[PDB]
Amino acid sequence: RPCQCNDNIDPNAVGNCNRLTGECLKCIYNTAGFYCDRCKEGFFGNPLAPNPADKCKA
Protein backbone atom coordinates (compact mmCIF):
# COMPACT_ATOMS: atom_id res chain seq x y z
CA ARG A 1 0.00 0.00 0.00
CA PRO A 2 1.91 3.03 -1.33
CA CYS A 3 -0.94 5.53 -0.84
CA GLN A 4 -2.90 5.59 2.44
CA CYS A 5 -6.56 4.61 1.91
CA ASN A 6 -9.25 2.18 3.14
CA ASP A 7 -8.87 -1.47 2.04
CA ASN A 8 -10.79 -1.12 -1.27
CA ILE A 9 -8.29 -1.08 -4.15
CA ASP A 10 -6.61 -3.60 -6.47
CA PRO A 11 -2.79 -3.64 -6.76
CA ASN A 12 -3.08 -5.20 -10.23
CA ALA A 13 -4.61 -2.41 -12.36
CA VAL A 14 -2.90 1.01 -12.28
CA GLY A 15 -4.42 4.43 -11.45
CA ASN A 16 -6.44 2.97 -8.52
CA CYS A 17 -4.89 5.81 -6.46
CA ASN A 18 -4.85 9.59 -7.12
CA ARG A 19 -1.25 10.76 -7.64
CA LEU A 20 -2.24 14.38 -6.88
CA THR A 21 -4.73 14.27 -3.96
CA GLY A 22 -3.35 11.01 -2.48
CA GLU A 23 -6.73 9.24 -2.14
CA CYS A 24 -8.42 6.16 -3.68
CA LEU A 25 -9.32 7.32 -7.23
CA LYS A 26 -11.38 4.21 -8.05
CA CYS A 27 -12.36 1.97 -5.06
CA ILE A 28 -12.93 -1.67 -6.14
CA TYR A 29 -15.95 -3.07 -4.22
CA ASN A 30 -18.60 -0.66 -5.63
CA THR A 31 -17.52 1.89 -3.02
CA ALA A 32 -16.93 5.64 -3.37
CA GLY A 33 -15.81 8.59 -1.22
CA PHE A 34 -12.45 10.20 -0.34
CA TYR A 35 -11.72 7.05 1.74
CA CYS A 36 -13.83 4.48 -0.16
CA ASP A 37 -16.12 4.74 2.88
CA ARG A 38 -19.21 5.16 0.68
CA CYS A 39 -21.17 3.19 -1.92
CA LYS A 40 -21.15 4.06 -5.67
CA GLU A 41 -24.35 5.81 -6.80
CA GLY A 42 -26.80 3.07 -7.86
CA PHE A 43 -25.80 0.66 -5.13
CA PHE A 44 -26.45 1.35 -1.47
CA GLY A 45 -25.83 -0.68 1.70
CA ASN A 46 -22.64 -1.04 3.76
CA PRO A 47 -19.41 -0.47 1.81
CA LEU A 48 -17.36 -1.37 4.91
CA ALA A 49 -18.70 -4.93 5.37
CA PRO A 50 -16.45 -7.98 5.73
CA ASN A 51 -18.68 -9.91 3.32
CA PRO A 52 -19.15 -8.72 -0.27
CA ALA A 53 -22.71 -10.13 -0.30
CA ASP A 54 -23.66 -7.50 2.30
CA LYS A 55 -21.63 -4.65 0.76
CA CYS A 56 -23.51 -1.96 -1.25
CA LYS A 57 -26.30 -3.65 -3.26
CA ALA A 58 -29.26 -2.14 -5.15
Side-chain angles (χ1 to χ4, degrees):
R1 214 69 91 265
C3 43
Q4 283 266 324
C5 192
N6 273 50
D7 191 81
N8 332 81
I9 58 114
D10 269 337
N12 280 112
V14 167
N16 279 204
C17 234
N18 321 10
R19 201 87 145 260
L20 68 162
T21 27
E23 76 175 86
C24 282
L25 224 206
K26 318 169 205 271
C27 315
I28 17 159
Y29 304 142
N30 318 141
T31 55
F34 188 99
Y35 280 111
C36 295
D37 249 49
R38 218 124 311 151
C39 295
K40 67 127 99 291
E41 171 72 50
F43 312 143
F44 329 104
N46 280 343
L48 288 121
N51 312 261
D54 283 34
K55 199 67 46 54
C56 315
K57 264 275 200 172

